[PDB]
Design a protein around this ligand. Structure first.
Ligand code: HEM
Length: 214
């Protein structure tokens, strides 16, 4: 399509369905998620966002990313830190898992941010616009399946406090993405990087499912 945001949505429809079909995601949707499984997911997210946000900060002023730099509205690291302290306890940093599949994703995020900056938008798009599109349904199924106490912690990651309206913000984020100037060659690389992001998530889901079924 014409708009980058429109191109991305179209090009990733296939892999997105693949992600929905992943065994781990299927069970999560079927309300079949265990606390051990959810903990692993949260640990994964922490590593992923730490890496992504480290690279976003590195390229914040670059013309290849600046247009989509929204630190206050989107940053998730602090929320995940809060959540992990609840899920793994006060010494969470020394006990949370960092698996090979998580490492593969983190490695690509750093490669992109350090040597292929123009593709970082593909990862920001996949993570942030994705969390803003179906994060409401995930949070719902989560709290209803984990039956956690009323301790007021554990799911901060699912709430973006600095965004008053998700619909309006997504419109703004899409507009900014479409404002980015890139050659047809780069545009193709960004589209392909978005598919790569989904694949990295899918391989992660597969690994997590394996770790939980021994
Ligand atoms: C449990 C599986 C999942 C479900 C049920 C789900 C559901 C949805 C829904 C309903 C939309 C469409 C929103 C709309 O346009 O009205 C959407 C969009 C999106 N999802 Fe997912 N999703 C899932 C997993 C993922 C994963 C694993 C990622 C990537 C890490 C992801 C990334 C995205 C992105 C980037 C969009 C934005 C599409 C656009 O540009 O409009 N989703 N998702």
């Amino acid at each position: 399509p014409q708009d980058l945001s429109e191109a991305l949505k179209e090009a990733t429809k296939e892999v997105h369905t693949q992600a929905e079909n992943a065994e781990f995601m299927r069970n999560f949707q079927k309300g079949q998620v265990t606390r051990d499984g959810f903990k692993l997911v949260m640990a994964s997210l922490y590593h992923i966002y730490v890496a992504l946000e480290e690279e976003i900060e590195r390229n914040k002023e670059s013309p290849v990313f600046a247009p989509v730099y929204f630190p206050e509205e989107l940053h998730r690291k602090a929320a995940l830190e809060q959540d992990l302290a609840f899920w793994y306890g006060p010494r969470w940093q020394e006990v949370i898992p960092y698996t090979p599949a998580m490492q593969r994703y983190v490695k690509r995020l750093h490669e992109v941010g350090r040597t292929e900056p123009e593709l970082l938008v593909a990862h920001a798009y996949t993570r942030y616009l994705g969390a803003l599109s179906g994060g409401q349904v995930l949070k719902k199924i989560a709290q209803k399946a984990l039956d956690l106490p009323s301790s007021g912690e554990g799911l901060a990651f699912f709430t973006f406090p600095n965004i008053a309206s998700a619909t309006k913000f997504k419109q703004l984020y899409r507009s900014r993405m479409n404002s980015l100037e890139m050659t047809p060659a780069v545009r193709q690389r960004v589209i392909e990087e978005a598919k790569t992001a989904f694949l990295l998530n899918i391989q992660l889901f597969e690994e997590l499912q394996e770790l939980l079924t021994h």
